[PDB]
Amino acid sequence: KPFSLPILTISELTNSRFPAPIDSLFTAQNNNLNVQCQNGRCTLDGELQGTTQLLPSGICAFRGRLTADVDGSHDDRWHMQLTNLNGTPFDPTEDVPAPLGTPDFTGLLFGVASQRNVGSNPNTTRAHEAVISTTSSQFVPKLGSVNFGSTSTDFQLQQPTKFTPVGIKIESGHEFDQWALPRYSGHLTLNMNLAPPIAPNFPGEQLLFFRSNVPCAGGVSDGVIDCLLPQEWIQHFYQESAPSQSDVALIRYVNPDTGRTLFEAKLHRTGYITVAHSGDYPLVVPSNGYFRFDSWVNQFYSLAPM
Amino acid sequence: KPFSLPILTISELTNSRFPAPIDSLFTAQNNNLNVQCQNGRCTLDGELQGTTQLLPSGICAFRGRLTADVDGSHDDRWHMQLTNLNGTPFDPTEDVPAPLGTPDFTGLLFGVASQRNVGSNPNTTRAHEAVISTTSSQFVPKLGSVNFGSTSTDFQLQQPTKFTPVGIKIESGHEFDQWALPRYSGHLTLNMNLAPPIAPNFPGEQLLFFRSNVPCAGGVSDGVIDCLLPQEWIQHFYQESAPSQSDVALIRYVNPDTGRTLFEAKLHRTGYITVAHSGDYPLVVPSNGYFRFDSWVNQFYSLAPM
């Protein structure tokens, strides 16, 4: 079964680490960065890794029930007992770092918490701005719960609850670090079942990122979130499950109108891209362009400079 | 090129008319309902119709700039001049009903309006709850603008602005009607370039819907939004572009574990499903099940009763 990429321009792609469109492509200078995001991780033959699931609506989202109000012990007073995103009960013994979709960054996640009542007063509803701090002592998704704070006090306990992500938030003491994983089991615990760290293994090569500037609810921020593979590619690989014939798939960025190849890159088996370049650089590419699979190669293949 | 469906269970599908997961399948009694949604419209050979675009993040979303504050003339004081979702300028002469992604229902759309400054004070940001009424006189997306109201007055004019949808809202005088199209060019205008109305053309057959219960920011509502094709199918057809060999594709709902076919349905060329059934009915199907393409048939094919 031949490997392939979907035919999608940059404005037809979704970030796999935040529900947002891709804004640009970016290659970053190497500086011993531990790149170990847990969303947007997938092998080329379609094996999802880390906390990666298929739905853009699932990325940085939560589902469960509010079971406690801990006002006066924590600023994030609303205690949310999690289920899986599909509503099945969360199983802490599953060999994953956290429930699928859980945020993989350090900072304030801004969104909306909503409820739809069951029991008496069925289908009464409410929804308000809410913030989840991924550094809070109450951010323990692998243990089965997270907390959020809100300006509104109009939340009901023991009712079905959903958190819809919208953006990030910058506050004093809460800087945003997209490459620092949260502690999924809370303070003084270490993470387990992680998708491995990623890095170029070849001299002169740098990682290529799919970059989004996501919304931010106050503070100075470019809202940058970089993913290794767009969500549509992950969805595509999952469907196709094409066997990887080598550890490296050469891909060509093409202009469909002219037919010209604009540059070439290495698409690695474990699901990331490298290019031959030195220095930070936002790629200057046409709006109609996209990657195409060329051929299987190996680790020793020398990329034409970008 | 052989036609096919993606292999996705119900909990791996996204609604094409609101960014939400599919919750259930539902067949509805016939009662001369004008079904003419404009999102989630696509032919089986991959031609998008109405206001349909590819990104779940684009469904019911807006992008543009705030260019006026009309407080004291309209409750929805913030005047948002639209661009296309990919940032290109909106072109009113394009043969579409409205910019791609525009909501196709009557009611209050609840979400978050956010901004990221350009010019001096670059990358300052803000985001607040906001509501868009699709019945407002200021809801004129085909003319190039929409308005929203907000509890916050902290919005800046002439700055890049985005509206992220979260749910619907129920207020007195603003009932929600998922099957009534808004007036894309405003009061006293009629819509143009619409994807056609849909209906069963066969005795004993009813439409099958992919149903979501979406969030709601107050009021009694089941939050039902029904789409004709999930977004992933649309994305799949767009990629494949398999020629339709007839006007009807027989599809089989299957249990992968047992191998059994649970029921059969007609997948029509113009992009909707019918089943043989009489009465409203939420389908009782296993969580692991999904549709598979069987064969091309014609209008005269008689479905096994469901």
CSV table of C-alpha atoms in Angstrom, one decimal, chain B residues 102-293:
chain,number,residue,atom,x,y,z
B,102,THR,CA,-21.0,31.4,8.0
B,103,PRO,CA,-23.6,29.9,10.4
B,104,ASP,CA,-26.7,28.5,8.6
B,105,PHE,CA,-29.3,28.7,11.4
B,106,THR,CA,-31.6,31.1,13.2
B,107,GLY,CA,-30.7,32.0,16.7
B,108,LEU,CA,-28.0,33.3,19.0
B,109,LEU,CA,-24.4,32.1,18.3
B,110,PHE,CA,-22.4,32.2,21.5
B,111,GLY,CA,-18.6,32.3,21.5
B,112,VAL,CA,-15.4,34.4,22.2
B,113,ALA,CA,-14.2,37.4,20.3
B,114,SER,CA,-10.5,37.9,20.5
B,115,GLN,CA,-7.9,40.4,19.2
B,116,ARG,CA,-4.2,40.6,18.6
B,117,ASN,CA,-2.9,44.1,17.9
B,118,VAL,CA,-0.8,45.2,15.0
B,119,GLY,CA,1.1,48.5,14.7
B,120,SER,CA,2.2,50.1,17.9
B,121,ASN,CA,1.6,48.1,21.0
B,122,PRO,CA,2.0,45.0,18.9
B,123,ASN,CA,0.9,41.6,20.3
B,124,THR,CA,-1.2,43.2,23.0
B,125,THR,CA,-4.3,40.9,23.3
B,126,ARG,CA,-7.8,40.6,24.7
B,127,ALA,CA,-10.7,38.1,24.5
B,128,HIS,CA,-14.2,38.1,25.9
B,129,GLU,CA,-17.6,36.3,25.7
B,130,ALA,CA,-19.6,37.6,22.7
B,131,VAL,CA,-22.9,36.8,21.1
B,132,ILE,CA,-23.9,37.0,17.4
B,133,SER,CA,-27.6,37.0,16.5
B,134,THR,CA,-28.1,35.6,13.1
B,135,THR,CA,-31.5,37.4,12.9
B,136,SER,CA,-30.1,40.9,13.7
B,137,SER,CA,-30.3,43.6,11.0
B,138,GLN,CA,-26.5,43.8,11.3
B,139,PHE,CA,-26.0,40.1,10.4
B,140,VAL,CA,-25.0,40.8,6.8
B,141,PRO,CA,-22.0,38.4,6.1
B,142,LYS,CA,-22.7,38.3,2.3
B,143,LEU,CA,-22.4,42.1,2.4
B,144,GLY,CA,-19.1,41.7,4.3
B,145,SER,CA,-19.9,42.3,8.0
B,146,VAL,CA,-21.5,41.0,11.2
B,147,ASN,CA,-22.0,42.5,14.6
B,148,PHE,CA,-21.7,41.0,18.1
B,149,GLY,CA,-22.7,42.1,21.6
B,150,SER,CA,-20.6,41.5,24.7
B,151,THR,CA,-20.7,42.1,28.4
B,152,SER,CA,-17.2,43.5,28.1
B,153,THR,CA,-16.5,47.0,26.6
B,154,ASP,CA,-12.8,46.1,26.3
B,155,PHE,CA,-12.5,45.9,22.5
B,156,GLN,CA,-10.3,48.0,20.2
B,157,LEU,CA,-11.2,49.3,16.8
B,158,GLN,CA,-9.2,48.7,13.7
B,159,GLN,CA,-7.5,45.6,15.2
B,160,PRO,CA,-7.4,42.0,13.8
B,161,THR,CA,-10.3,40.2,15.4
B,162,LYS,CA,-11.6,36.6,15.5
B,163,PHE,CA,-14.8,35.0,16.6
B,164,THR,CA,-14.5,31.5,18.0
B,165,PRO,CA,-17.9,29.7,18.3
B,166,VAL,CA,-18.7,27.7,21.5
B,167,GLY,CA,-22.4,27.2,21.5
B,168,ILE,CA,-25.9,28.6,21.1
B,169,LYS,CA,-27.9,30.7,23.5
B,170,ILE,CA,-31.6,30.8,24.4
B,171,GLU,CA,-33.3,34.1,25.3
B,172,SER,CA,-36.9,35.3,25.3
B,173,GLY,CA,-37.7,36.3,21.7
B,174,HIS,CA,-34.6,34.5,20.3
B,175,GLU,CA,-35.7,30.8,19.8
B,176,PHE,CA,-33.3,28.5,18.0
B,177,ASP,CA,-34.3,27.0,14.6
B,178,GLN,CA,-31.6,24.9,13.1
B,179,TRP,CA,-33.5,24.5,9.8
B,180,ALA,CA,-34.3,28.2,9.1
B,181,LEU,CA,-31.6,29.9,7.1
B,182,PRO,CA,-30.5,33.4,8.1
B,183,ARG,CA,-30.8,36.3,5.7
B,184,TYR,CA,-27.1,36.5,4.6
B,185,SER,CA,-27.6,40.0,3.1
B,186,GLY,CA,-29.9,41.3,5.8
B,187,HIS,CA,-33.5,42.3,6.3
B,188,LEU,CA,-35.8,42.4,3.2
B,189,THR,CA,-33.2,40.5,1.1
B,190,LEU,CA,-33.3,37.0,-0.3
B,191,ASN,CA,-30.5,34.5,-0.4
B,192,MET,CA,-28.7,33.4,-3.5
B,193,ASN,CA,-26.3,30.7,-4.7
B,194,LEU,CA,-27.8,28.2,-2.2
B,195,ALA,CA,-27.1,24.5,-2.1
B,196,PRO,CA,-30.5,22.9,-3.0
B,197,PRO,CA,-33.1,21.6,-0.6
B,198,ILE,CA,-32.9,17.9,0.4
B,199,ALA,CA,-35.7,15.4,0.8
B,200,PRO,CA,-36.4,11.6,0.4
B,201,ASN,CA,-37.7,10.9,-3.1
B,202,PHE,CA,-38.8,7.4,-2.2
B,203,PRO,CA,-41.9,6.0,-0.4
B,204,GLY,CA,-41.2,4.7,3.1
B,205,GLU,CA,-37.9,6.5,3.3
B,206,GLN,CA,-36.7,9.1,5.8
B,207,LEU,CA,-33.5,11.2,6.2
B,208,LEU,CA,-30.8,10.0,8.5
B,209,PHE,CA,-28.9,12.6,10.5
B,210,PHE,CA,-25.7,12.9,12.4
B,211,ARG,CA,-26.7,14.5,15.6
B,212,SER,CA,-24.8,16.6,18.1
B,213,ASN,CA,-26.0,18.2,21.4
B,214,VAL,CA,-23.9,21.3,21.5
B,215,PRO,CA,-23.2,23.6,24.4
B,216,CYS,CA,-25.8,26.3,25.3
B,217,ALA,CA,-25.2,29.4,27.4
B,218,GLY,CA,-28.5,29.5,29.3
B,219,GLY,CA,-32.1,28.5,28.7
B,220,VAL,CA,-33.8,25.2,28.2
B,221,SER,CA,-32.4,23.4,25.1
B,222,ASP,CA,-31.2,20.0,24.0
B,223,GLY,CA,-28.7,21.9,21.8
B,224,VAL,CA,-29.6,19.7,18.8
B,225,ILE,CA,-27.8,20.4,15.6
B,226,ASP,CA,-28.2,17.8,12.8
B,227,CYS,CA,-25.9,17.5,9.8
B,228,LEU,CA,-26.3,15.4,6.6
B,229,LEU,CA,-22.6,14.3,6.3
B,230,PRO,CA,-19.9,14.5,9.0
B,231,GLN,CA,-17.0,16.8,8.4
B,232,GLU,CA,-14.6,13.9,8.0
B,233,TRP,CA,-16.6,12.4,5.2
B,234,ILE,CA,-16.6,15.7,3.4
B,235,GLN,CA,-12.8,16.0,3.9
B,236,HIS,CA,-12.5,12.4,2.6
B,237,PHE,CA,-14.6,13.0,-0.6
B,238,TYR,CA,-12.8,16.2,-1.3
B,239,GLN,CA,-9.4,14.3,-1.2
B,240,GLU,CA,-10.6,11.2,-3.2
B,241,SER,CA,-12.8,12.8,-5.8
B,242,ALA,CA,-14.1,9.3,-6.8
B,243,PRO,CA,-16.5,9.6,-9.7
B,244,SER,CA,-20.1,8.7,-8.8
B,245,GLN,CA,-21.1,5.7,-10.9
B,246,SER,CA,-24.8,6.2,-10.1
B,247,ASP,CA,-27.1,8.5,-8.2
B,248,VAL,CA,-27.2,6.2,-5.2
B,249,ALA,CA,-24.4,4.5,-3.2
B,250,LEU,CA,-25.7,1.6,-1.0
B,251,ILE,CA,-23.9,1.7,2.3
B,252,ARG,CA,-23.9,-0.9,5.1
B,253,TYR,CA,-23.6,-0.2,8.8
B,254,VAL,CA,-21.3,-2.9,10.2
B,255,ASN,CA,-20.1,-4.3,13.5
B,256,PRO,CA,-16.3,-4.9,12.8
B,257,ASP,CA,-16.0,-7.4,15.6
B,258,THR,CA,-18.8,-9.7,14.6
B,259,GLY,CA,-18.7,-8.9,10.9
B,260,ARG,CA,-22.5,-8.6,10.8
B,261,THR,CA,-24.3,-5.9,8.8
B,262,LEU,CA,-26.7,-4.1,11.2
B,263,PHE,CA,-28.7,-2.2,8.6
B,264,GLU,CA,-28.4,-0.7,5.1
B,265,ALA,CA,-28.9,2.8,3.8
B,266,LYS,CA,-28.8,4.9,0.6
B,267,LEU,CA,-26.0,7.5,0.3
B,268,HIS,CA,-27.2,9.9,-2.4
B,269,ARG,CA,-24.9,11.6,-5.0
B,270,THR,CA,-25.7,15.1,-3.8
B,271,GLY,CA,-24.6,14.2,-0.2
B,272,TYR,CA,-27.2,12.8,2.2
B,273,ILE,CA,-28.5,9.5,3.6
B,274,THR,CA,-31.9,7.9,3.7
B,275,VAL,CA,-33.2,4.8,5.5
B,276,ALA,CA,-36.4,2.7,5.4
B,277,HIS,CA,-38.2,3.6,8.5
B,278,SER,CA,-41.4,5.3,9.7
B,279,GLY,CA,-41.2,7.6,12.8
B,280,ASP,CA,-38.6,9.5,14.8
B,281,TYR,CA,-36.0,7.1,16.1
B,282,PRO,CA,-32.6,7.4,17.7
B,283,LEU,CA,-30.6,4.4,16.3
B,284,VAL,CA,-29.5,1.7,18.7
B,285,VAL,CA,-26.1,0.8,17.3
B,286,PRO,CA,-22.8,-0.5,18.9
B,287,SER,CA,-20.1,2.1,19.8
B,288,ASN,CA,-17.6,0.3,17.5
B,289,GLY,CA,-19.8,0.4,14.4
B,290,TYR,CA,-19.4,2.4,11.1
B,291,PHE,CA,-20.7,2.6,7.6
B,292,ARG,CA,-19.0,0.9,4.6
B,293,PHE,CA,-19.6,1.5,0.9
